[PDB]
């Protein structure tokens, strides 16, 4: 049974774009139907890493449930997670992707954080996250309070260290900033470890799934 994505793109649906709860959360599909010009996708501008690969790996799915990998209300006691952006506005008001959280400073501080998740679900788990690139050094300090920040995602198959590239860009939707989006597959049994002292757009929901 095919999966209609409406006016949304694979990026938008899987990220949890606010203009993308739209649609009939489905549990299985054979192929993915997507308009050539979808209007609400990566609402906050930025590059989605390895996008064609993700569309293929998701082209065929037999089971699919969303679940809250890092619960919004218990995972982040030392960080503000409320931040929203006018670029992701639902019904007029500013908002954000439902599956990610924009972690920002709290009490004037952004402490080193590290949270992990072990796959116990007997299914492949799809994990998405972003890294934020502010357009100038004033924004970097305002959001994370440090000029030299790092993000490091490390699992058994994935090992990357992101440093934010801070500079002026051309404007997409009046934003000069970028969030770069990233994704890895989590084997039943594997564990993924996030470490950062800024710029992490942390995962909130992930997906368990299979392909036949």
């Amino acid at each position, epitope marked *: 049974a095919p999966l209609q994505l409406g006016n949304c793109s694979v990026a938008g649906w899987i990220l949890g774009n606010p203009e993308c709860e739209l649609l009939i959360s489905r549990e299985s599909w054979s192929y993915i139907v997507e308009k*050539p*010009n979808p209007e609400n996708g*990566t609402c906050y*501008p*930025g*590059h*989605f890493a390895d996008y064609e690969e993700l569309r293929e790996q998701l082209s065929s799915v037999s089971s699919f449930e969303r679940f809250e990998i890092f619960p919004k209300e218990s995972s982040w006691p030392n960080h503000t997670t409320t931040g929203v952006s006018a670029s992701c506005s639902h019904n007029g008001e500013s908002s954000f992707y439902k599956n990610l959280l924009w972690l920002t400073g709290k009490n004037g501080l952004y402490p080193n954080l590290s949270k992990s998740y072990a796959n116990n679900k007997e299914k492949e788990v799809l994990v998405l996250w972003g890294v934020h690139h502010p357009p100038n050094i004033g924004d970097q300090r305002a959001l994370y309070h440090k000029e030299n920040a790092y993000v490091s995602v490390v699992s058994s198959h994935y090992s990357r260290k992101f440093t934010p*590239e*801070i*500079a*002026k*860009r*051309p*404007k*997409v*939707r*009046d934003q*000069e900033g*970028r969030i*770069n989006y990233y994704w890895t597959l989590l084997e039943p049994g594997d564990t993924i470890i996030f470490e950062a002292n800024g710029n992490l757009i942390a995962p909130r929901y992930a997906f368990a799934l299979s392909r036949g």
Partner: antibody
Amino acid sequence: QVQLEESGPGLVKPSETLSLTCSVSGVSVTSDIYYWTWIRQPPGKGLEWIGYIFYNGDTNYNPSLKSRVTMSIDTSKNEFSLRLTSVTAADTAVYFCARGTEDLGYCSSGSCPNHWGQGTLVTVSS
Amino acid sequence: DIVMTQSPSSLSASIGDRVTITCRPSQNIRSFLNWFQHKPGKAPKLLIYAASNLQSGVPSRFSGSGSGTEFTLTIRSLQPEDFATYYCQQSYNTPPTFGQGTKVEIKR
């Protein structure tokens, strides 16, 4: 907020090498998120992209010109340069330097120069 | 290698008029299309990037539209300072290539 000042001969004799410099002010030529570009416009024709160079070393030159152009970065002077060999009257043009900001989601690599200098005219003549 | 055709090559319009310039790539380029403005003796300025995003400092009477194989820059009410030559530029495959330009003059 960034300035790009172009400099160079104005007159080049045919077959000789044209050299131009763009002195960059307001950012560092070593910041790896930007790339540096040259563009030209022959009299009465359209704009023709020459190439981009990133400080980390990745470069790409227009295939129409790739066998005659090289670009370089001089960190000591916060400059970058264009060298064009074996020129003819077809190379008479206003040459623009430009900065771009890498943004692969909205632009291919090195292809959206968004701060241009105002250009310097080079006339090829003997 | 992607060839850009802009139309028309020249136009005149009165103050307050709605002006429209079209751009046609030689193959489909999605949203990877930018618009530049070049006023006399000045540095070229990026007005619209990725088909429809108004760049900072650009007045909101400028808007870009289209995708795929037809693109449009519209000026909803011409002003004297909008005298310039406008160019489209595809950012879809390298090398970046430009249209021949549309020179806009005013009628007063």
